[PDB]
Design a protein around this ligand. Structure first.
Ligand SMILES: CN(C)C[C@@H](c1ccc(O)cc1)C1(O)CCCCC1
Ligand code: NA
Ligand code: NA
Length: 499
């Protein structure tokens, strides 16, 4: 079985997974709308009661599984719990990241395409007034995506957008086909520093931004000024717990698959805690210092609320490109920005596609080459739904990363720490550990963590159990995908009985 070569590379691959566009866009937006600096209170609390506990558990299940030649949850859940239902629930953790891959790789391709357009200077050049500056870029994006101009829910992405998507897919395949160490790990050792340099450079450049409307200091001010009165809102406490899931990448079955390449007695306690810390530093230090401050510096702290409510996607693909076009050498600033984003996604997308690569290897005994190609073929195919069907993307993201990760996360807890046995599990976590997990965490993992997750489930339920008919197409497809994965798992166990 493949293994990580260096302890360092392991951490950089894991942190590479967790560090994403959410660090630079999603996290800052959430913080600004939920108490600013006061949002750190329920965020840190969720990091300690939910994030860290769940993270160690996924590392634990991963390594425990990897030692027995299985990297995915259909096999692993069966090992912790020998039921038929256990294999079935495990499919979710093979299904979730595949659904995400169907739209993520595509969104990742946008950043690549934008980065190219910005580098060669093929971008709009306005003109005055905010709507007169934003609109040329709002249109720049819509022509790339192919946002419907009529009542039809049909996207018509440009030939360039589609071609970059191909190139992007090809780039993912290139790394993945070289394997865990020589491919993913080797790239993590290059990408993560390159990422850090780009972030710092942009951070410095943003702090020097001075416009008649404001400064970057005003941005860091508006963002970090604590509004404790919002801490009374449960919704803030829910947003924090949800954000932790998103920022760390819990409930996707990726950490599990990665940790299955960790050797049987190698440390997962300190290593995981480290990669988790790298991610959080990248969020609060780098991500919170670029997007929002620049937006406030140019549009004033007066629009700082409106900017935050405009959504993370607008901030990163319309607002920030528009601000750059109005700065000295801003067209190159746009390129660094998108190239920063592109790598941040590319380190995450190779990580998410590894789960399917692992399954085909471990359970269907495919060569790494075949597993990678058939995985790419599936992800490439499904993406056409995201590319051509309007709001298809939103529907996949709702199911896969709304119900999916929070439900499947709780399923990970119960199976490992309740069914498999809390005591056996606690040993499985701490075994070979450079440092040991604090004794108090045994209670958190057993009660507090699943309590929070259950509340997030019911709170999601009541609010979200309550769209155009075309969603049924996306629902039809993702349901079908689950069925198809169920079939492969079925074929996997029929092959094993023969041998
Ligand atoms: C949150 N992280 C770490 C990135 C993940 C993700 C999941 C959902 C989403 O909306 C964006 C990214 C992702 O890496 C999961 C595997 C498939 C690619 C995306
Ligand atoms: Na993150
Ligand atoms: Na990444």
């Amino acid at each position: 079985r493949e293994h990580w070569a260096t302890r360092l590379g392991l951490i950089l691959a894991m942190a590479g997974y967790a560090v994403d566009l959410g660090n630079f866009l999603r996290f800052p937006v959430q913080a600004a709308e939920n108490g600013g600096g006061a949002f750190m209170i329920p965020y840190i609390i969720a990091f300690l009661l939910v994030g860290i506990p769940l993270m160690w558990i996924e590392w634990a299940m991963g390594r425990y599984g990897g030692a027995q030649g299985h990297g995915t949850t259909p096999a692993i859940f069966y090992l912790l719990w020998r039921n038929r239902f256990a294999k079935i629930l495990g499919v979710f953790g093979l299904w979730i990241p595949l659904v995400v891959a169907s739209y993520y790789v595509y969104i990742e391709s946008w950043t690549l395409g934008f980065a190219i357009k910005f580098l060669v200077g093929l971008v709009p050049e306005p003109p005055t007034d905010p709507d007169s500056i934003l609109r040329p870029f709002k249109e720049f994006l819509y022509s790339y995506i192919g946002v419907p101009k009529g009542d039809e829910p049909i996207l018509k992405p440009s030939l360039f957008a589609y071609i970059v998507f191909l190139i992007t897919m090809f780039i993912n395949v290139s790394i993945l086909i070289r394997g865990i160490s020589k491919g993913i790990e080797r790239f993590a050792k290059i990408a993560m520093p390159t990422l850090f340099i780009l972030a710092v450079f942009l951070v410095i450049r943003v702090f020097l931004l001075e416009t008649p409307n404001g400064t970057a200091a005003d941005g860091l001010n508006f963002l970090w000024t604590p509004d404790f009165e919002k801490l009374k809102d449960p919704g803030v406490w829910i947003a924090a717990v949800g954000q932790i899931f998103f920022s760390l990448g819990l409930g996707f079955g990726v950490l599990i698959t990665f940790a299955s390449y960790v050797r049987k007695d190698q440390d997962i306690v300190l290593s995981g805690l480290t990669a988790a810390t790298l991610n959080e530093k990248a969020s609060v230090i780098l991500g919170g210092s670029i997007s929002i401050p620049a937006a406030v510096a140019f549009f004033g702290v007066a629009n700082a609320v409106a900017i935050a409510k405009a959504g993370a996607f607008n901030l990163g693909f319309i607002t920030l490109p528009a601000i750059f076009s109005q700065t000295a050498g801003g067209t190159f600033l746009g390129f660094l920005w998108f190239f920063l984003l592109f790598f941040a996604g590319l380190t995450s997308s190779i990580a998410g596609m590894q789960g399917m690569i692992a399954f085909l290897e471990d359970e269907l005994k495919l060569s790494r080459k075949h597993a990678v190609l058939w995985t790419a073929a599936i992800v490439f195919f499904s993406a056409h739904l995201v590319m051509f069907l309007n709001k298809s993307l939103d529907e996949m993201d709702f199911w896969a990363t709304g119900i999916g990760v929070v439900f499947f996360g709780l399923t990970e807890l119960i199976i490992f720490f309740w069914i498999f046995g809390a005591d056996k599990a606690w040993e499985e976590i701490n075994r070979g550990g450079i440092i040991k997990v604090p004794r108090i965490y045994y209670y958190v993992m057993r009660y507090i963590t699943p309590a929070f997750l259950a509340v997030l489930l019911v709170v999601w339920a009541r609010e979200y159990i309550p769209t155009h008919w075309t969603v049924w197409i996306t629902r039809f497809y993702i349901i079908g995908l689950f069925l198809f994965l169920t079939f492969l798992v079925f074929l996997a166990e029929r092959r094993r009985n023969h041998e």
